[PDB]
Amino acid sequence: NAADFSLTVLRARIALLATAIGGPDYTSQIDPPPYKLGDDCLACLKDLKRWFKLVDDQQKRWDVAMAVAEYRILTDDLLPILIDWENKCSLAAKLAKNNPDHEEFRNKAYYDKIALNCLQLLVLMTWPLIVTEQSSSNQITLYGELKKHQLVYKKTILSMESGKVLRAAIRLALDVIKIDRLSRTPRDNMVLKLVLNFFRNVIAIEPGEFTINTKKSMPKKGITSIDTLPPNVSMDDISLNTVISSFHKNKVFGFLLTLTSSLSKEFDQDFINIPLLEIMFYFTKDVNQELLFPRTSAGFELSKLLQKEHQMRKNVIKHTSARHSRFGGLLSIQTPDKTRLTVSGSQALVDEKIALQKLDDSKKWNKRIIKKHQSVAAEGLPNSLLNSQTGKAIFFTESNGKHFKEFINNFIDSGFNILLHSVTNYFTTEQDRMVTLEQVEYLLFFAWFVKYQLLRSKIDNSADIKQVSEALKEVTFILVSSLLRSAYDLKNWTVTHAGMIAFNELLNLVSRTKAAQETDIEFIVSRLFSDERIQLLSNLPKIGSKYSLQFMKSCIELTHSVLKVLEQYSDDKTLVIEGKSRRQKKFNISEGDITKLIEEENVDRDEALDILTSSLRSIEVNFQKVQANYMTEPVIETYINFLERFRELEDDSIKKVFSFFHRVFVQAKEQALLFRFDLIILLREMLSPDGLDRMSRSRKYVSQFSDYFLARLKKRLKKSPAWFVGLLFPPLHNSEVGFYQRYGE
């Protein structure tokens, strides 16, 4: 009985400390009770810090955090102290601005110290909870309940008189900022890092995940809920709309803007370069850029959604029986091989297809579908576009959406370039030491802001694309490409997905800058497609089909971007690329040749030797070879697997898939890749009234491709009946007959 005795004495001591911090001053008679500090209360703040140090850190326990959380130290002690300090300092600043050296604080240093210690406890207690492997069983047991207590913390921070603690935190930051750059000690810049970390804790708190034990078999009741919410906390309090509202009301956005825009001239950038990027990522991990531009209007889209629902409901009730359930109708169908098969239904009486769909659906044997089990959640990472569903939408309001649009616009127009340059300065030396979290957030920050500036420049001509021009430096090229390559070779798949998104948006930015101006563009397209990266982008779709839907959609968008940026050089032929030479490329140099090159391009001979070596590995690639390398059967397998989810996707992704199917089936002219039966079943499902809408623009090119596909199919089967077997099975590899199977000789 040592464990529960230690737990109850620890809870008793935290209860005594929480009573010893302060009181609401019920002795004074004010209609709101003003919070009064207790006697010897700064020592209590140091005791909470000492308890969180000695127990929570080295001993690998989280009992102190819940012992604090159940006694409401953050809710009832730290926040009233910080808000009282904020209100008193604001009133004193007003009275000192009107008349200086009148009505001072009695003990301002004490109040500043206890405010700083309260902010330290806010950062230390709202830290993001990650539970990796080999951790203690106490943390594994306590993780979900501590995530719920952190959700209560985020709601209480954002909701207490619209978040005056954010104003307290920025006041603690401008205590540092008012000091000159030369007179600032590193402790003051560490206080600035504390404030930026507090804002990243406020943004970064998200609802937890529901973990189940799979040792026992799942019963017949199954999962009834996956809700992981505290009682008073709803999904609206946690959501980003309240974050944007509380940040705009308390001028957090102007604080972040004025530290981002003067990061190099005013602040020591190495202290706050990483928490600033973490803050930007924690805004932009769950925001889609297409939904931020909306292009009675809510009722307009509502009326269109009810028309779509009415058409789908009509197509559903076509299959629904007109009579009741007990009105028994039995139908015996025969094949031309004489047999009797019985189905039970009323709608299935008249049409053959509903009856055959009944006969397919009456079976109770289901094949195994193996699952990856979503191992991304095992790593310590937030929910983002790599984890959310493709159909997930963030529902910004008018004012919150306008404030977020203004903040992101001023961020890009002020200091996206300086922040990106500072981060790619820092990470290019810390590349081999960063864990997956910084790689994922760097690639997502880069890709999100590049995509948002691309979309803003496409929508409006007032914005300049050169505001993300520092995305196009060689250092960011090297960093993104090396991150993607190191993610692939170590078989890390989250960073591979983030780098795939970043490379797709990098190619989109290069294509936009090339279409704008027709130069350094040939240099950078030679730089990205150098080394073995064409083979990397070629074999990324071959391994796509095993992983999740978002990985496969990124494979779609990356391969579409690769083929679009490489089809621009089909006639221009400018495809000189640094390649990796394998066997001996040694050449006996000639110093006369070296000196005449020195006269030619005005070079020193050491870097001319470098140029002479680098000219030997230069090769040229064929775009037809790039297409024919992309036409492997697992690429078609993963694209057919992506087209299976055609209900969830929008028009753009299936437009990309059918554009690549036009590339396979019309241009490249080998057609046996698409002569498989899963595509035929999927095309029947898409062209049915239950599938794609007739008013949607997707069904037009789906129908056109299916018409041309069945025309070539009937041509191939009329010329050769043996392909009646070939639709069932994967294509054949024997060289004596495989040419006739693939091309028809």
Binding site: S90, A93, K94, K97, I170, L174, I177, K178, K251, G254, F255, L257, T258, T260, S261, S262, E266, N410, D413, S414, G415
Partner: peptide, 20 residues
């Protein structure tokens, strides 16, 4: 579009004064 820190201090003090 450079954002000044002294402008942020002035806006902080002014919105402390009247808040508009």
């Amino acid at each position: 579009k450079f954002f000044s820190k002294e402008s942020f201090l002035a806006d902080f003090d002014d919105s402390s004064s009247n808040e508009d």
